[PDB]
Amino acid sequence: TFGVVIAD
């Protein structure tokens, strides 16, 4: 989430 790939 949020555009951060590792955070999805």
Side-chain angles (χ1 to χ4, degrees):
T1 306
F2 189 70
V4 181
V5 297
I6 57 176
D8 171 86

